[PDB]
């Protein structure tokens, strides 16, 4: 739920 990024 925490400490996860995101790339697009």
């Amino acid at each position: 739920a925490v400490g996860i990024g995101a790339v697009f």
Epitope: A1, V2, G3, G5, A6, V7
Partner: antibody, heavy 120, light 108 residues
Framework: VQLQESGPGVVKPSETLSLTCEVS???????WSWIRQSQGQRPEWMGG????????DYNPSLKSRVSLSRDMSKKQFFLNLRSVTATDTAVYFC???????????????WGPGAQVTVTS | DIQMTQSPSSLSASVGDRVTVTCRAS??????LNWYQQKPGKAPALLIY???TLQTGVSSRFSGSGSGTQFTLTISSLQPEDFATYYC?????????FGGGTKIDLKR
């Protein structure tokens, strides 16, 4: 992606433990953490940060002693552990956690780990 | 902080067995639990995340279930390469915390 830890393998007690992580890399933000693990023990998450802001989250069992930062231009992110004792002897991993929302993959990248030993 | 209680500390199994590893959370952690395999000298490798999603490239005989506080990792047909230590990891809240570990070894 690939991560690689780097820094001294021996640190005198009371001194500061410093390590670098070389991050290999296309538009977004990563969560970079340091997770350490002493022999015969479970891993301990020390802290993490988001690469786009550098805002840190710290494990309360260390908070005063641990510092994290990153340099996007050099693709590095750093650990400083102040006033170490012999019980800070551990293997230190840098790990990257991020979801590719285009492909819906989860990605969980660990370095090979750097053993550091606190001793005089 | 939340803490996982892993069970059993070690578990004896033969090649081909169906084997179960369990993780208990002190608080409700929804389905924010991950399962790791670790071999000696190596970094832990992610097998299952979000309680039941199989990570890319992981063999399909690995499976996870549970929600709330009770979670289970099942190895359907244990192979020699499965002999390792396994950790659960909660990422429902900070700090991330790991279970105590389960070393699966060869039965004799």
């Amino acid at each position: 992606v690939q991560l690689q830890e780097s820094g001294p393998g021996v640190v005198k007690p009371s001194e500061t433990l410093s390590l670098t992580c070389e991050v290999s890399l296309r538009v977004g933000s990563y969560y970079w953490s340091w997770i350490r693990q002493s022999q015969g023990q479970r891993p301990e998450w020390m802290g993490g940060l988001y690469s786009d802001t550098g805002n840190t989250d710290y494990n309360p069992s260390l908070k005063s002693r641990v510092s994290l930062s990153r340099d996007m231009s050099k693709k590095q992110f750093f650990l400083n552990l102040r006033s170490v004792t012999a019980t800070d002897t551990a293997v230190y991993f840098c790990v990257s956690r991020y979801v590719d929302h285009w492909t819906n993959r989860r990605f969980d990248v660990w370095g090979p780990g750097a053993q550091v030993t606190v001793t005089s | 902080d939340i803490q996982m209680t892993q069970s059993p500390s070690s578990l004896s199994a033969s090649v081909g067995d169906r084997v179960t590893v369990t993780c208990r959370a002190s608080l409700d952690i929804n389905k924010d639990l991950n399962w790791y395999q670790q071999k000696p000298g190596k970094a832990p490798a992610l097998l299952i995340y979000a309680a039941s999603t199989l990570q890319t490239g992981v063999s399909s005989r690995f499976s996870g279930s549970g929600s709330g506080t009770q979670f289970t990792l099942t190895i359907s047909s244990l192979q020699p390469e499965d002999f390792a230590t396994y950790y659960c990891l909660q990422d429902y809240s900070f700090p991330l915390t790991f279970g105590g570990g389960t070393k699966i070894d060869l039965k004799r």
